[PDB]
C-alpha cells in the first residue's frame, strides 16, 4: 500500500495473508468470507507469464495478522488448503479479466477479536455503493513504494473512479468485471495498492446496515500511485454467481 497508514488492531479482521511454504514469504493478500472459505485474486495462484502456478500444498493462509513478518503467537491462526478454485474464464493471457479464486480450508478457523468474515455484496448493496466518488478501503502488506516493506498491515481509503476515466487512463482493455479507484492528479490526496497487495479486499461500510462489504479484489495497476493511473479491482458482485456455485457445490 502506497501513501497509506498503519491499520488499527482488529480494523480488518477478514484480512488474510497468503504465505509460501518454501521459501517462507508473503505471496498475496486474501479475505475471509466464512469459517472455511478464503477469497483472493486468481493471479495470486496462476500467472504463466511469471511461471506462477501454485498447488494447494505450496501454500498456507495466515489469518488474524497485524505484523507482516512476526509470528503472532496466540493471535494469528495458520490454515492449510484443501482445494483451490480458479474462475474457469480467468483471463491471464490478456487483461486479468475475472481475476478471482476461492480457497477452501482443511478445517474451519475459529473466529476471535482478530478473525471475522467480511460480507459479500448483494445486487442492491452493489448498485447503491459502487458509484464514482464513493470511497472504499484497501488493506495489505505489499510494497510501500513502486520502486520498502511495512512492519504492519497498511490501510488506505480511495474513491471509486468514473468508468470513462478508468478506460482513458490505460491501454489495457477494461471490462465490466473490473472497476478502478484512486485520486486524480488534481485532487491532491493520493494512495494505491502495490505489488504484494494483490488478492486483498477493497471494502465499503454500508450506511444502511453498518456492515462491511467486500466490493473488490486488488487486481492490477501500471506502477503504483502514479499520477493519472488508477488501481484496478475485481468486481466481486459481478462474479458472485460463480462464487455461490463453487461454495454450493463444494461446501
Amino acid at each position: 500500500i502506497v501513501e497509506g497508514s498503519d491499520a488499527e488492531i482488529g480494523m480488518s479482521p477478514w484480512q488474510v495473508m497468503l504465505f509460501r511454504k518454501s521459501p517462507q514469504e508473503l505471496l498475496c493478500g486474501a479475505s475471509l468470507i466464512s469459517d472455511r472459505w478464503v477469497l483472493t485474486a486468481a493471479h495470486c495462484l496462476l500467472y504463466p507469464p511469471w511461471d506462477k502456478n501454485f498447488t494447494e500444498n505450496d501454500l498456507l493462509v495466515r489469518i488474524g495478522k497485524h505484523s507482516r513478518t512476526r509470528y503472532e503467537r496466540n493471535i494469528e491462526k495458520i490454515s492449510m488448503l484443501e482445494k483451490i478454485y480458479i474462475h474457469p474464464r480467468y483471463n491471464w493471457r490478456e487483461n486479468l479479466d475475472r481475476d478471482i479464486a476461492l480457497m477452501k480450508l482443511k478445517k474451519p478457523v475459529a473466529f476471535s477479536d482478530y478473525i471475522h468474515p467480511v460480507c459479500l455484496p448483494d445486487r442492491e448493496t452493489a448498485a447503491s455503493l459502487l458509484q464514482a466518488g464513493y470511497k472504499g478501503r484497501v488493506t495489505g502488506w505489499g510494497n510501500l513504494k513502486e520502486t520498502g516493506q511495512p512492519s504492519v498491515l497498511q490501510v488506505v481509503n480511495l474513491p471509486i473512479v468514473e468508468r470513462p476515466v478508468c478506460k482513458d487512463s490505460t491501454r489495457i482493455r477494461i471490462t465490466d468485471n473490473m472497476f478502478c479507484a484512486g485520486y486524480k492528479p488534481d485532487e491532491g490526496k493520493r494512495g494505491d495498492a502495490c505489488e504484494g497487495d494483490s488478492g486483498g479486499p477493497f471494502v465499503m461500510k454500508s450506511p444502511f446496515n453498518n456492515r462491511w462489504y467486500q466490493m473488490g479484489i486488488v487486481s492490477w495497476g501500471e506502477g503504483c500511485d502514479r499520477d493519472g493511473k488508477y488501481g484496478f479491482y475485481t468486481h466481486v458482485f459481478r462474479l458472485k454467481k460463480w462464487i455461490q456455485k463453487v461454495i454450493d457445490q463444494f461446501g
Partner: peptide
Amino acid sequence: EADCGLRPLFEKKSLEDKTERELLESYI
C-alpha cells in the same frame, strides 16, 4: 454468516475506527 462484516473490536462494541467517517462522508 449472519454476523458477517461486524468487527468484534469496532461495530460489536460500538467503537469507530479513525477513518471510517471518511467513507461515510463520501456516500452522498
